[PDB]
Amino acid sequence: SKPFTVPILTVEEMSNSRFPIPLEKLYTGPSSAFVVQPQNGRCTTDGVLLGTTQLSAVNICNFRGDVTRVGISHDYTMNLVSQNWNNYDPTEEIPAPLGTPDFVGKIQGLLTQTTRADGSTRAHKATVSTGSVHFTPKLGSVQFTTDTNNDFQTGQNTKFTPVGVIQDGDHHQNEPQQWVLPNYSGTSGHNVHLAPAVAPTFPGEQLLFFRSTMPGCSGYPNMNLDCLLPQEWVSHFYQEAAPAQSDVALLRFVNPDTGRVLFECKLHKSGYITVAHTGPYDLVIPPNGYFRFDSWVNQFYTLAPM
Amino acid sequence: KPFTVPILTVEEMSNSRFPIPLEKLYTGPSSAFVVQPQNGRCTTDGVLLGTTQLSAVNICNFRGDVTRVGISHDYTMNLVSQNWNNYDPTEEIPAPLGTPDFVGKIQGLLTQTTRADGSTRAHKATVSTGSVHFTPKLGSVQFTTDTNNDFQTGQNTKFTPVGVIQDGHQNEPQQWVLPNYSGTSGHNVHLAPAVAPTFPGEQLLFFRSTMPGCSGYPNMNLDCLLPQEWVSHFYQEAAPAQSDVALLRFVNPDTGRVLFECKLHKSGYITVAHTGPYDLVIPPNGYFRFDSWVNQFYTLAPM
Ligand SMILES: C[C@@H]1O[C@@H](O[C@@H]2[C@@H](O)[C@@H](O)O[C@H](CO)[C@H]2O[C@@H]2O[C@H](CO)[C@H](O)[C@H](O)[C@H]2O)[C@@H](O)[C@H](O)[C@@H]1O
Ligand SMILES: C[C@@H]1O[C@@H](O[C@@H]2[C@@H](O)[C@@H](O)O[C@H](CO)[C@H]2O[C@@H]2O[C@H](CO)[C@H](O)[C@H](O)[C@H]2O)[C@@H](O)[C@H](O)[C@@H]1O
């Protein structure tokens, strides 16, 4: 049956699967203090999409719909539609629309709008607070704070394009909280249909993360953003749909110039990586290095230490 | 190695000329103007062309340090690469990889971090690619912003694009007019070639998106020759071309029925047999499938 592979793209050639920005580096660290349960960048090695994961990075943390002003304030409610402007279905068995933010934080960008009848357009700086009780994407609406109280029109197609994150408070880097899921239905109900939490189980192991730095837009935010799989790996597995022959795919990270293996890791078939290391470590890698699938192993495979 | 194209549907893919999803397929005449985009250019055997790079999220982004123009709201950015290292103007490319390849006013947010204390900031900003100060091949561009004092010198600064504006209707942007990458100081160099159908009865097939509009009455259509995912696929696979033309069938997998066939030229663009403007009608699960290597003279069934 179809041989399994991972892409040959280098880390810096790839994209974060949790926000529309490039990858910067590989990082491993302790996760015992967190529940690591992201909903974007979740895909099995056989190509089954999980959580809120969809196929292109450009759609992540984007929103579309019509807007109405909240009272006489600068806030606007967006009634969500799908990526292609068709109705959103809240009864679909997913946690929230595909691409919905999967962390608690205040994401800043531009809210843009076109008036269909005459082609007039407009844009305003806007922020969505995903920890707000008004963040209810599973129910079909989210709220934005904007720089206007009267320029947006009702009944017109409106898009939010994300740019970065903000923070407010004396406790610097206290938000965003990248490992805290929002309440997709607000106070109305609990989250449903989630991709599972992941954790290392084998002695001496940690998760391996693909790390980016989100742009900061105001205050003193925590800009670190870790994903479990690059977006290009999600797309690759989805298209290849190569069957998993065991629970774990052993990958070697290779320098293509010398041919030498730098380290090895375990790609679990449910779509995340562990390495043999303890503590925070920014991996020291050559920029042309890439991952290579070598063989099908089990969960108890003892890796060469990082 | 057998040549293939991705099995992704149109709406699962991204525009290779701006960081937005694909929406639809369009064919029309293009004899009256020059089709020479520089992003989304790649040969079927994986050679990147023009200003093309590998991820959609880096297109029309800019990074560098900024300095205010006088005491105005405009800022000059001295460009660096995606990972904050040197841009070399002597490299034989038209401009940095990912540079905009149309004349227009692109609006987004200009963001900055002060490294010493982690303070951050963001301001609405526009880059006019038809401006004499749009000189990315020289290493700099100019932004008009909504501040005249908040940006600091010597600090990492990023422009994230969102959409386009217009002044004066739908007269700008001009998607098929390349900017002058060196301004008035020199002519464009090292360009991916202009494209045109050569076989009678054929037209280009375009992968189309709508750029968000941010002010005025802009022309929001944006057509690319190859989805970004196809660029990335060919780059990785590097499958040899057995002729100059790959025959693709667009298939509805619900039925196994072929909806239309098209020619994917080795140098990286598609033609169909049709005369006139046409918005293609496709099922949501439709996709392109490579069937065989043929020649410039193979007659396509009418689209
Ligand atoms: C940390 C600063 O963040 C940005 O400024 C903030 C505004 O975006 C908004 O949220 O209001 C707060 C408080 O009014 C702003 O913070 C103040 O900004 C000034 C500089 O203009 C001083 O730095 C104060 O100490 C901040 O409290 C951003 O525009 C600014 O440059 C800073 O990064
Ligand atoms: C077409 C309008 O575009 C946007 O408004 C423009 C501003 O973004 C800025 O460029 O200044 C111009 C002219 O002062 C603005 O155009 C006017 O906007 C008013 C409404 O505020 C009227 O529509 C005029 O006819 C425009 O000339 C945008 O915010 C606005 O909603 C319109 O789409």
Cα distance from N-terminal residue to C-terminal residue, chain B: 29
**Residues 6 or more apart in contact with residue A259 via CB below 8 angstroms:** none
Chain B CB within 8 Å of residue A118 CB: yes
Cα gap A274→A212, rounded to integer Å: 18
Residues of chain B immediately before an interruption (C to N > 2.5 Å): 168
Chain A CB within 8 Å of residue B145 CB: no
CA B107 to ligand 2 centroid distance, Å: 15
3-state secondary structure chain A: CCCCCCCCCCHHHCECCCCCCECCEEEECCCCCCCECCCCCCECCCCCECCCCCCCHHHCCCEEEEEEECCCCCEEEEEEECCCCCECCCCCCCCCCCCCCCCECEEEEEEEEECCCCCCEEEEEEEEECCCCCCEHHHCEEEEEECCCCCCCCCCCEEEEEEEEECCCCCCCCCCECCCCCCCCCCCCCCCCCCCCECCCCCCEEEEEEEEECCEEEECCCCEEEECCCHHHHHHHHHHCCCCCCCEEEEEEECCCCCCEEEEEEEECCCEEEEECCCCEECCCCCCCEEEEEEEECCCCCCCCC
Q: Are residues B15 and B152 in the same domain?
A: no
Side-chain half-sphere exposure of B218, counting CA atoms within 13 A: 27
Side chain identity at residue B171, one-letter code: N
Q: Are residues A82 and A202 in the same domain?
A: no
Q: Are residues A152 and A254 in the same domain?
A: no
3-state secondary structure chain B: CCCCCCCCCHHHCECCCCCCECCEEEECCCCCCCCCCCCCCECCCCCECCCCCCCHHHCCCEEEEEEECCCCCEEEEEECCCCCCCCCCCCCCCCCCCCCCCECEEEEEEEEECCCCCCEEEEEEEEECCCCCCEHHHCEEEEEECCCCCCCCCCCEEEEEEEEECCCCCCCCECCCCCCCCHHHCCCCCCCCCCCCCCCCEEEEEEEEECCEEEECCCCEEEECCCHHHHHHHHHHCCCCCCCEEEEEEEECCCCEEEEEEEEECCCEEEEECCCCEECCCCCCCEEEEEEEECCCCCCCCC
> B20 is written with which tokens?
């937005």
Which atom from ligand 1 is nearest to the alpha carbon of B112? 33
- CB contacts of B112 in chain A (<8 Å) are 216
Q: How many domains does chain B have?
A: 2
Torsion (CA) A143, A145, A148, A153 in degrees, nearest 10: -10
Q: Which of A113, A116, A118, A122 to mutate to test the pocket of ligand 2 (most atoms within 8 A of CB)?
A: A122
Side chain identity at residue A21, one-letter code: I
**Boundary of a domain, candidates B133, B165, B197:** B165
**Boundary of a domain, candidates B127, B142, B165:** B165
- Resolution in Å, one decimal, please: 1.4
Sign of the four-CA dihedral A234, A63, A85, B167? negative
Cα gap A212→A225, rounded to integer Å: 5
- CB contacts of A57 in chain B (<8 Å) are 14, 55-57
Q: Are residues A30 and A130 in the same domain?
A: no
Cα gap A8→A129, rounded to integer Å: 37
Residues with CB under 6 A from ligand 2: A 120-122, 151; B 215-216
**Which one of B57, B165, B215 has the shortest CB-CB distance to A15?**
B57
Cα gap B111→B124, rounded to integer Å: 9
Q: Are residues B79 and B68 in the same domain?
A: yes
**Residues 6 or more apart in contact with residue A212 via CB below 8 angstroms:** A16, A19, A21, A22, A23, A24, A225, A227
B279: CATH: 2.40.510.10
Chain B CB within 8 Å of residue A297 CB: no
Q: Are residues A70 and A26 in the same domain?
A: no
- CB contacts of A163 in chain B (<8 Å) are 108-109, 111, 122, 160, 162
Q: Are residues A91 and A155 in the same domain?
A: yes
Which residue's CA is minimally distant from atom 23 of ligand 1? B119
Q: Are residues A98 and A221 in the same domain?
A: no
**Residues 6 or more apart in contact with residue A154 via CB below 8 angstroms:** A66, A67, A68
Give yes or no for a contact between A94 and A50, defined as CB atoms under 8 angstroms apart. Answer: no
Q: Are residues B83 and B230 in the same domain?
A: no
**Which one of A20, A166, A220 has the shortest CB-CB distance to B57?**
A20
Q: Are residues A280 and A131 in the same domain?
A: no
**Of B17, B129, B6, the residue nearest A58 (C-alpha):** B17
Torsion (CA) A226, A80, A110, A173 in degrees, nearest 10: -30
CB-based contact B236 A7, cutoff 8 Å: yes
Which residue's CA is minimally distant from atom 30 of ligand 2? A122
Side-chain half-sphere exposure of B201, counting CA atoms within 13 A: 11
CA A129 to ligand 1 centroid distance, Å: 18
Cα gap A45→A159, rounded to integer Å: 32
Q: Are residues A263 and A278 in the same domain?
A: yes
A83: CATH: 2.40.30.120
Q: Are residues B172 and B184 in the same domain?
A: yes
CA A218 to ligand 1 centroid distance, Å: 7
Give the residue on B whose Cα is nearest the Cα of A20. Answer: B57
Which residue's CA is minimally distant from atom 27 of ligand 1? A219
**Boundary of a domain, candidates B165, B185, B214:** B165
Closest ligand to the CA of A221: 1
**Of B243, B257, B76, B241, the residue nearest B153 (C-alpha):** B76
Sign of the four-CA dihedral A293, A294, A298, A300? negative
- CB contacts of B97 in chain A (<8 Å) are none
**Residues 6 or more apart in contact with residue A33 via CB below 8 angstroms:** none
Cα gap A287→A231, rounded to integer Å: 18
> B148 is written with which tokens?
């005249």
Cα gap B21→B219, rounded to integer Å: 17
Judged on CB neighbours under 10 Å (0-12, 13-18, 19+), B162 is buried
Side-chain half-sphere exposure of B2, counting CA atoms within 13 A: 7
Cα gap B151→B157, rounded to integer Å: 9
Q: In which region does residue A159 sit, left (phi positive, over 0), alpha (psi from -120 to 50) or beta (all else)? A: beta
Q: B6-36: b or e for each residue (b if 16 or more CB lie within 10 Å)?
A: bebbbbbbbbbbbbbbbbbbbbeebeeeebb
Structure-token match 């375990």, residue found: A266
- The domain in which residue A41 lies consists of 1-59+167-306
Give yes or no for a contact between B10 and B267, defined as CB atoms under 8 angstroms apart. Answer: no
Side chain identity at residue A18, one-letter code: R
Q: How many CB atoms lie within 10 A of CB B1?
A: 8
